[PDB]
Design an enzyme around this catalytic site. Structure first.
Site, PDB file in Angstrom:
ATOM      1  CG  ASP A   1      -2.059  -1.015   1.074  1.00 24.48           C
ATOM      2  OD1 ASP A   1      -2.578  -1.194  -0.047  1.00 24.48           O
ATOM      3  OD2 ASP A   1      -2.411  -1.642   2.095  1.00 24.48           O
TER       4      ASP A   1
HETATM    5 MG    MG Z   1      -3.365  -2.384   6.905  1.00 25.24          MG
END
Ligand code: MG
Ligand code: ZN
Ligand code: ZN
EC number: 2.7.7.6
Lengths: 71, 115, 66, 111, 55, 157, 144, 172, 56, 447, 112, 83, 270, 57
Positions: free
Chosen positions: B93
């Site tokens: 991410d």
């Molecule tokens: Mg996370």
């Protein structure tokens, strides 16, 4: 005892030339001077940095020990 | 039919092309976005206050939020985004942000605290 | 709040074109795209600088100062 | 706060040098050179010019981490050819090419 | 006291009264305040039926 | 036929073949009697309990039955002289490697087997996804020993 | 140094799912047993159907300077320079690979498998005599 | 903004800054445009966030044309119309662009998706969450480290950590 | 359970994690401030007296 | 901290930024991402504790998990996609990039491998560099479907003396598999060798991917005209079949399966038909996709995505269901006010025909919202129940130990198992093997 | 037979999704739960009602009831369980604590 | 009670035993204590402990406790270190 | 025509943009030149700001950042020494330029503050530096702040030499276009397509300066990248031709410094 | 509560709101007590006077 305590100073030479800050803690030869624009503390020699007035005025070197005063 | 959504859901662009959990997460996390909450600031003494330096209106506007004054008080910025695998530092991410854009005043903001 | 001085992506100075853009939009009577092209912005990175900019400085100036 | 200063990527500090050559024991006539405060700008040029040489059997560079502005260059040359001589020749060729390019650009812009 | 603490009732019997009726207004962005001003709560005091979205 | 077992014989024999450079054409130097004696010695050399009385000896003997079956299957005379052709030194190396791996694969006393089992059972439960009851409710009713399960069932053959 | 030589007329080139590698099938124009299935880089060496490509397997690429006297193992391959002529000058496609399989097809037919990196070759001979001096790494040379 | 600050898109695609690159190191297109953000493509197929790409394409078309784009739900706007408009502007039907490596200048083998996207800065920052304690203030009743970062507290060693260390066998 | 089964300990740090492809498998990137705050006692002995004096 | 791999001992490396940095392959046992996760750090304060952590809780010592008897770490994220693209048969590298890639390997001996093609232009295959990264002495052999010594599909894997011969490297080779490369390396060589292999593979693949590039776009989820026409025809055929079933049931001509009512069997048939139609449409869409598709490349590598995601994104979204059944009649014999009473058509009961790319009508949008709400509620309840169950299980088995007599006993000394696992073998030192004696025929066994 | 059926049910529950768990863990769990002549549920009324240490039993649930019963009766905590050592802050006799280390004179006089 | 030399445990060193001896030796060398090997330019106590354990020059005795209460003493030098 | 190495061919010349074609040069040198022109050219910009009075509705940091982003003339930047290399205490005329800005609100309507209001108070000693860059037709400049009646803004700035690597405010170039091989003759990229590649991918504007590829021709494996088309756009502080010349000079200086360090260390070690 | 019939800002125009240091974009609907804004969350309850019949276990 130490003159460099709570007095606004300007950092000379090095990578922080012309910066304005106030010395908070002084121990031995190194002096911890905070920074106005930057939120960090840098420890430099007290002799290298010049000394200014809190309200504003001309800057002087570490000769404040002889004068035993400010400004 | 677009009026069946709430205030937070009216900000999402093309909500019909997205998974429902994604829309729910966006609605939940939209309240944490940074922006100009009110024009009355600098006159108010609040415990916390975050103001974006250069708020920008979204490019993909929706008709629903025209009445929500979102275009007058935006809570984000338009940034060029490239979807690529560069240097392997944006895995999972993580994301890679330009240093020059940050130095030029991208996403920087102000913080106010009152005692 | 106020128009940025330089474009975030490349670095073109776009802080001197806000007044010209407003003047073109308000009496020259053309759409935003042609006005942006006339100003000199060809890349969308510079176009988004003033196309999606909100001038909240007037709202702050509306309040009575000291 | 742990933000490194912005001048540490192009300013030499104290106790470190711009260049540092250490012999490589993996292969004969191979050395490793470490450059401090530059990356990805002249290293590629040096590697390309070394590859252009005919007496250089190996030339590569890498950056260990983007956090620190430094890279290591490894040169392996043929027997009897010092890698430092190859580096000097590559630098001289780069200087000559840059000077010629500047002169040509000035001449073209003059008209 | 009722408007501040959020416990609907007098100072006594506070533990037997509803909690969270009054909350500090969330002022972080305009959308957050608008959403907070249009919020409803279901006092439940384990069950998935009341939490599901009905037709 | 595919079951988890301690020592991988196939990897060991492949490594021996690769590291000894078998010609696969020259006749082998191994003998049937030597192969059988080596297999028996390897079988007798697998110690898990290391006891001297009858009960511990019987437990050690019958606690390695599956491994002995696998070793006999993978070290048959026909297999050795036809498919996995090794010399005397390669065969001795294979036997020594098998013995060393088996000795190194034994459990270490002092291990917290209970906590390991509890975690290894609880992790899939947390990772479990969403008419016979199954999933988290079934596991909960099994652990709690429910006297009246939701979906009892019977199977008659 | 040379270990094999034939004409190997090719046919039925399969483009496959790739864009630069093609799998071809060939057949000797002399012996009636030799068959060759090889993958080649058509971007560098284009090949069309019904073509004759003289193949050659050599233990080492060195010329008469060294009569294939083994050696030259893990030499940290260096870029070619002016001169230093080798067997690659005569041919137009030279590949280096590793042998990994020696399956016997029948009582007389044998099959040798070669892997030139990601490209595989299956060479089938006869009587275990034509493809007898194939033991380890070797160079494959193809002439138009 | 610095490394560790939380940034989220308008479609539930949250994330944090892992690295920061200068303009020269960032990849660039043929027109010299460098991206402000780089997002890994391994997050789209799992979450099926098609609206993110559709909004990016619509924003790119709107920026090129100068007219505001409509992203209201249940409308007549389709991907084909946006693609046709982008092709009329003369960039690409699907928004792909040819980019160059910032380190060597070589052309990238794979084309890179490009286009502006709306992003918001969240309230969670690493500067307000980093903590470290070594023999700090003491409690009164239990004589155990105090609670909270603002009071210079210490991290809690829960029962899960205890039983994990039990399983590890580290008794000392 | 809140004071005996599990308690609060010193010499601990907590911050947001991040990825680093250039770091090895058994390696963790500790920030400079966290490293400065945390300390490890070392017995003054030969074979490290010079290093300990330099650190002091 | 669900399992013992949730806390492990690392080595401190001081970095000039205020954030914890760790290897990408380490996140998988930790079950952590980089979207805001915070993780604790503990510093030992004595020599014996440091030695215990170094020799018992080290990262390389926990590669093989005793729970599933499989490695708990492997190549993930974009590294998997890069290693799949690099190993492809049509990937060729030049000398300039090959030298840099070789130098990027920390333990490269210093010998340049001979290029695969030398005559027209010196080119090195990606498999050569990958084998250079792989240490010598490891032999791996796996045969997939239709895999032979001359496999044309480049499936399977064969490694001899640490050299790749054929086969693409994917999740089944460098992932968390039973007989993958990681497991073989860990079993043969030391854990430090496995960690070095991890680092070298990650470095080389990351460099190659950085200098090659990989992206995704909206156009990757778009199918051609004929494929969409075929999908629409399949959906129409399924709807016609459902309508025929409804017409047959309404005339009382339907036969109910034994043990089920006239409604349960009809609903089961309807949902089976809808699921079959969705699966067929997804398979058609996946088949239509080319090899250059980014989503297809990600799915084939196994790093992220699946066939169901591609189906729902390109062809058709599956029918929304509640607790396994279709959308119930919230109103009086109606699902929404926009429908009619006693309507059993698939569209009115919660079947989505459009895909995510095409967009959803308000009704299917509401149905998808209901499904997402059900999923969120399920996760919220399940996490609490599983936490309680795990706590009880841990508390109920915290005193079980294996003593020096190879017996399993509790704190009281009572014997539970006379030998651990009925065989006295460590879980992490067990591999799946096949017994030839049990299988086969009598004639084959005798031969 | 009940233990075998319980193991089969546990395996069916675990393998329903597709995950794999080693046989040793499930076997240990079912042996612990059926150590006595009947099922011992993992609850307050099951394993927490045995002759183990009072501190270990009280650490799970019903802390003051168990302590009250121990005080009323004559309960001696021999204290080699992990929970008791954790409470007392001593090195538990598990893992590296299952053995003691001693120093011998003969080795000292032989090495030096 | 001590089981004479009719011991029946394993003639090898477990991982926990290896860790415990390594830690104890590391602590002892870290404090001012004699070393029975040639440092040879090593200054980390743990590495000195491993160097001592390399040729079994550690004067430590392992006491393995049986569950009943009996214990048998195993010398470090006589314990095979295969791990 | 000076030397057989790199060659140039200017397609268009302007005060803000320059278009030229690089020939007989390699990819590495062109990329290095682009990077140097991006983030290596020294420039003069405001570094430290002293705020005396600020009654406006903008924070001091806001105005400081906006002033630091204002371009300044840097024609004679080679005659100004670095602040760290100067022997002064904080700043002086030989290493810095001091600018003062004073603004007051008198008219009822909003009073804008422009970059043209900046006044240089230090002695330039004849150097052509410190003048704010104005390119607008109205001759106003960059809008710094807007004031109403009763508000005052008095402050003093100092300008210091720096490079774009330290901070993005010192960058003299806005955007640099880099492109080579308009056709895929070198096969350096793979074109993503659905049905066709030529139809879906638009042709670049530089395709007319190169011969189109010939169908049915073998792939030229001996061909490398040697022709590059570059467009350089300047912010306004430095002219484009001077920008390119300074970039080449900076690259030459870096190479010469490397050579000097190598020679010095060789002498010291021998 | 703000912007009510008894509030001073009900009849205030934009100029009056600006003079009173109040944001014209403010919507009101909250209570100002002790200097802190408070908002009453709507409570959900079953309707009364409704006959309902259910099935027990
Ligand atoms: Mg996370
Ligand atoms: Zn721009
Ligand atoms: Zn000066």
């Amino acid at each position: 005892r130490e003159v460099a305590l709570g007095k606004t100073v300007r950092i000379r030479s090095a990578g922080y030339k012309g910066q304005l800050g106030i010395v908070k803690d002084v121990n031995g030869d190194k002096a911890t001077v905070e920074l106005h624009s930057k939120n960090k503390h840098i420890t430099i020699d007290k002799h290298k940095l010049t000394y200014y007035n809190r309200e504003g005025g001309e800057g002087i070197t570490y000769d404040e020990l002889v004068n035993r005063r400010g400004r | 039919p677009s009026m069946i959504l709430g205030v937070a859901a009216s900000i999402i662009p093309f909500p019909d092309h997205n998974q429902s959990p994604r829309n729910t997460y966006q609605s939940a996390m939209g309240k944490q976005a940074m922006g100009v909450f009110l024009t009355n600031y600098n006159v108010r003494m609040d415990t916390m206050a975050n103001i974006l330096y250069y708020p920008q209106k979204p490019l993909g506007t929706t008709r629903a939020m025209e009445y929500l004054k979102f275009r007058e008080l935006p809570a984000g910025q338009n940034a060029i985004v490239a979807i690529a695998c560069y240097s392997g530092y944006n895995q999972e991410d993580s994301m890679i942000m330009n240093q020059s854009s940050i130095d030029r005043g991208l996403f920087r903001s102000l913080f106010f605290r009152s005692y | 709040m106020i128009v940025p001085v330089r474009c975030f992506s490349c670095g073109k100075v776009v802080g001197d074109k806000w007044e010209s853009y407003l003047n073109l939009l308000q009496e020259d009577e053309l759409d935003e795209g042609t006005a942006l092209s006339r100003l000199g912005l060809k890349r969308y990175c510079c176009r988004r600088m003033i196309l999606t900019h909100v001038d909240l400085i007037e709202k702050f100036l509306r309040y009575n100062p000291l | 706060m742990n933000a490194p200063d912005r001048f540490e990527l192009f300013l030499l500090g104290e106790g470190e040098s711009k260049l540092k050559i250490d012999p490589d024991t993996k292969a004969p006539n191979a050395v490793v050179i470490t450059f401090e405060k530059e990356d990805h700008t002249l290293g590629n040029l040096i590697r390309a010019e070394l590859l252009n040489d005919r007496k250089v059997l190996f030339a590569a560079y890498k950056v260990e981490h983007p956090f620190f502005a430094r890279f290591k260059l490894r040169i392996q040359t043929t027997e009897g050819y010092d890698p430092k001589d190859a580096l000097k020749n590559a630098c001289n060729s780069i200087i000559n090419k840059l000077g010629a390019l500047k002169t040509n650009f000035e001449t073209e812009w003059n008209l | 006291y009722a408007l501040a603490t959020g416990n609907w009732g007098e100072q006594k019997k506070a533990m037997s009264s509803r909690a969270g009726v009054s909350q500090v207004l969330n002022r972080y962005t305009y959308s957050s305040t608008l959403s907070h001003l249009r919020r409803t709560n279901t006092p439940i005091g384990k069950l998935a039926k009341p939490r599901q979205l009905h037709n | 036929a595919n079951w988890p077992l301690p020592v991988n014989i196939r990897r060991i024999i492949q490594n021996a073949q690769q590291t000894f450079h078998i010609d696969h054409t020259k006749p082998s130097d191994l003998t049937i009697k030597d192969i059988v004696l080596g297999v028996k010695d390897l079988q007798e050399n697998l110690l898990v309990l290391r006891g001297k009385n009858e009960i511990i000896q019987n437990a050690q003997r019958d606690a390695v039955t599956l491994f002995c079956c696998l070793l006999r299957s993978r070290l048959a005379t026909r297999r050795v002289l036809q498919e996995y052709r090794l010399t005397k030194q390669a065969f001795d190396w294979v036997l020594s490697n098998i013995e060393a791996q088996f000795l190194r694969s034994v459990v270490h006393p002092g291990e917290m087997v209970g906590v390991l089992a509890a975690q290894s059972i609880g992790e899939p439960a947390t990772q479990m996804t969403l008419k016979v009851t199954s999933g988290v409710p079934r596991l909960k009713e099994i652990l709690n020993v429910a006297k009246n399960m939701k979906t009892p069932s019977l199977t008659v053959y | 140094n040379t270990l094999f030589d034939d004409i190997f007329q090719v046919s039925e080139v399969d483009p496959g799912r790739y864009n630069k590698v093609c799998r071809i099938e060939a057949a000797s124009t002399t012996q009636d047993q030799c068959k060759l299935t090889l993958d080649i880089n058509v971007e560098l060496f284009p090949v069309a159907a019904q073509d004759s490509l003289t193949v050659t397997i050599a233990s080492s690429l060195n010329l008469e300077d060294t009569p294939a006297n083994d050696s030259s193992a893990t030499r940290s391959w260096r870029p070619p320079q002016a001169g230093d002529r080798s067997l690659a000058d005569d041919y137009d496609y030279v590949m280096y690979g590793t042998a990994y399989k020696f399956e016997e097809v029948s009582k007389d037919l044998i099959a040798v498998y070669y892997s030139f990196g990601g490209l595989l070759m299956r060479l089938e001979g006869n009587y275990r005599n034509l493809n007898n001096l194939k033991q380890e790494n070797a160079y494959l040379l193809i002439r138009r | 903004p610095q490394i560790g600050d939380k940034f989220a898109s308008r479609h539930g695609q949250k994330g944090t800054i892992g690295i920061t690159y200068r303009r020269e190191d960032m990849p660039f297109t043929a027109e010299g445009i460098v991206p402000d953000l780089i997002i890994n493509p391994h997050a789209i197929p799992s979450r099926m966030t098609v609206a993110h790409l559709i909004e990016c394409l619509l924003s790119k078309v709107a920026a090129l044309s100068g007219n505001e784009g409509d992203a209201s739900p249940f409308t007549d706007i389709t991907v084909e119309g946006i693609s046709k408009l982008l092709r009329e502007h003369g960039y690409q039907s699907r928004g792909f662009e040819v980019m160059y490596n910032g380190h060597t200048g070589k052309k990238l083998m794979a084309q890179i998706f490009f286009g502006p996207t709306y992003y918001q800065r969240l309230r969670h920052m690493v500067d307000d969450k980093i903590h470290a304690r070594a023999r700090g203030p003491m409690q009164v009743l239990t004589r155990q480290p105090v609670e909270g970062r603002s009071r210079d507290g210490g991290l809690r060693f829960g029962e899960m950590e205890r039983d994990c260390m039990i399983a590890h066998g580290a008794a000392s | 359970r809140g004071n005996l089964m599990g308690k609060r300990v010193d010499f601990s740090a907590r911050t947001v994690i991040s990825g680093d492809p250039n770091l090895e498998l058994d390696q963790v990137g500790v920030p400079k401030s966290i490293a400065k705050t945390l300390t490890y006692p070392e017995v003054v002995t030969p074979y490290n007296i010079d290093r300990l004096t330099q650190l002091v | 901290s669900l399992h013992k791999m949730s806390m492990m001992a690392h080595r401190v490396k001081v970095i000039p930024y205020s954030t914890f940095r760790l290897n990408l392959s380490v996140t998988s046992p930790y079950n952590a991402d980089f979207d805001g996760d915070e993780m604790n750090l503990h510093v030992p304060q004595s020599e014996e504790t440091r030695a215990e952590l170094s020799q018992l809780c080290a990262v390389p010592l926990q590669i093989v998990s005793p729970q599933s008897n499989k490695p708990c770490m492997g190549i993930v994220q974009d590294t998997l996609c890069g290693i799949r693209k690099l190993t492809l048969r049509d990937t060729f590298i030049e000398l300039d990039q090959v030298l840099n890639m070789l130098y990027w390997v920390p333990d490269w001996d210093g010998v340049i491998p001979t290029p695969a093609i030398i005559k027209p232009k010196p080119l090195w295959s990606g498999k050569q560099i990958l084998s250079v990264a792989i240490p010598n002495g490891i032999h791996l052999q796996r045969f997939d479907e239709g895999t032979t010594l001359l496999s044309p599909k480049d499936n399977g894997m064969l490694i001899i003396d640490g050299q790749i011969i054929f086969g693409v490297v994917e999740k089944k080779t460098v992932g968390s598999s039973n007989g993958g490369l990681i497991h073989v390396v860990t079993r043969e060589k030391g854990p430090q060798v496995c960690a070095k292999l991890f680092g070298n593979i990650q470095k080389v693949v990351n460099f190659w991917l950085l200098h090659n590039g990989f992206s995704t776009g909206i156009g990757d989820t778009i199918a051609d005209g004929p494929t969409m026409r075929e999908i629409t025809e399949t959906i129409a055929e399924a709807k016609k079949k459902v309508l025929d079933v409804t017409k047959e049931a309404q005339a009382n001509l339907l036969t109910a399966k034994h043990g089920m009512t006239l409604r349960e069997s009809f609903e089961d048939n309807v949902v089976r038909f809808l699921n079959e139609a969705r699966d067929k449409a997804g398979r058609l869409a996946e088949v239509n996709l080319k090899d250059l598709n980014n989503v297809k490349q990600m799915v084939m590598a196994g790093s992220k995505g699946s066939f169901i995601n591609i189906a729902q994104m390109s062809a058709c979204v599956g029918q929304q269901s509640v607790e396994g059944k279709r959308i119930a009649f919230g109103f009086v014999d109606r699902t929404l006010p926009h429908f009619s009473k006693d309507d059993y058509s698939p569209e009115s009961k919660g079947f989505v025909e459009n895909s995510y790319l095409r967009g959803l009508t308000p009704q299917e949008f509401f149905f998808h919202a209901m499904g997402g709400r059900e999923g969120l509620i399920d996760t919220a309840v399940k996490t609490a129940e599983t936490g309680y169950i795990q706590r009880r299980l841990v508390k109920a088995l915290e005193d079980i130990m294996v003593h020096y007599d190879n017996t399993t006993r509790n704190s009281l000394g009572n014997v539970i198992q006379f030998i651990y696992g009925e065989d006295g073998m460590d879980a992490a030192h067990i591999e799946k093997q096949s017994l030839d004696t049990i299988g086969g025929s009598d004639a084959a066994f005798e031969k | 037979a009940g233990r075998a059926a319980l193991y089969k049910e546990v395996y069916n529950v675990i393998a329903s999704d597709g995950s794999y768990v080693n046989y040793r863990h499930m076997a240990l769990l079912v042996d612990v739960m059926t150590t006595q002549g009947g099922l011992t549920s993992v609850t307050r009324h099951g394993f927490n009602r045995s002759n183990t240490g009072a501190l270990m039993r009280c650490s799970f649930e019903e802390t003051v009831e168990i302590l009250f019963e121990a005080g009323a009766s004559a309960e001696l905590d021999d204290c080699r369980g992990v929970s008791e050592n954790v409470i007392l802050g001593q090195m538990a006799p598990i893992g590296t604590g299952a053995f003691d280390v001693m120093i011998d004179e003969e080795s000292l006089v032989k090495y030096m | 009670a001590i089981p004479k030399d009719q011991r029946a445990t394993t003639p090898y060193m477990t991982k926990y035993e290896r860790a415990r001896i390594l830690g104890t030796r590391a602590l002892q060398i870290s404090m001012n204590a004699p070393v029975f090997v040639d440092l040879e330019g090593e200054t980390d106590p743990l590495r000195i402990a491993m160097k001592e354990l390399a040729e079994k020059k550690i004067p430590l005795v392992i006491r393995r406790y049986l569950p009943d209460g009996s214990f048998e003493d195993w010398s470090v030098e006589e314990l095979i270190v295969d791990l | 025509m000076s030397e057989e190495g790199p060659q140039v061919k200017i397609r268009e010349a302007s005060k803000d943009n320059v278009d030229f074609i690089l020939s007989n040069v390699d990819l590495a040198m062109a990329n290095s030149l682009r990077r140097v022109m991006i983030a290596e050219i020294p420039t003069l910009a405001i570094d430290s700001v002293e705020v005396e009075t600020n009654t406006t509705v903008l924070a001091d940091e806001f105005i400081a950042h906006r002033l630091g982003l204002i371009p300044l003339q840097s024609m004679d930047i080679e005659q100004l020494e670095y602040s760290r290399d100067c022997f002064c205490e904080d700043h002086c005329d030989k290493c810095s330029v001091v600018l003062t800005l004073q603004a007051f609100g008198e008219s009822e309507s909003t009073t804008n503050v422009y970059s043209k209001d900046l006044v240089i108070v230090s002695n330039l000693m004849g150097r052509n530096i410190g003048h704010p860059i104005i390119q607008d037709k109205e001759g106003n400049g960059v809008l710094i702040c807007k004031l109403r009646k009763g508000q005052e803004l008095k402050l003093t700035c100092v300008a210091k030499k720096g490079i774009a690597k330290e901070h993005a405010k010192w960058g003299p170039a806005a955007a640099i276009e880099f492109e080579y091989d308009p056709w895929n003759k070198l096969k350096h990229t793979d074109y993503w397509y659905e049905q066709d590649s030529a139809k879906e991918w638009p042709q670049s504007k530089n395709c007319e300066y190169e011969d189109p590829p010939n169908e049915g021709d073998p792939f030229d494996y001996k061909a490398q990248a040697d022709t590059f088309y570059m467009n350089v756009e300047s912010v306004g502080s430095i002219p484009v031709d001077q920008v390119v010349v300074r970039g080449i000079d900076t690259l030459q200086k870096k190479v010469a410094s490397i050579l000097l360090a190598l020679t010095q260390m060789d002498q010291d070690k021998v | 509560m703000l912007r009510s019939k008894n509030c001073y800002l009900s009849e205030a125009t934009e100029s009056d709101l600006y003079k009173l240091k109040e944001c014209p974009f403010d919507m009101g609907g909250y209570f100002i007590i002790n200097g802190s804004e408070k908002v009453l969350i709507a409570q959900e309850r079953s309707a009364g006077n409704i006959v309902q019949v259910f099935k027990k276990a």
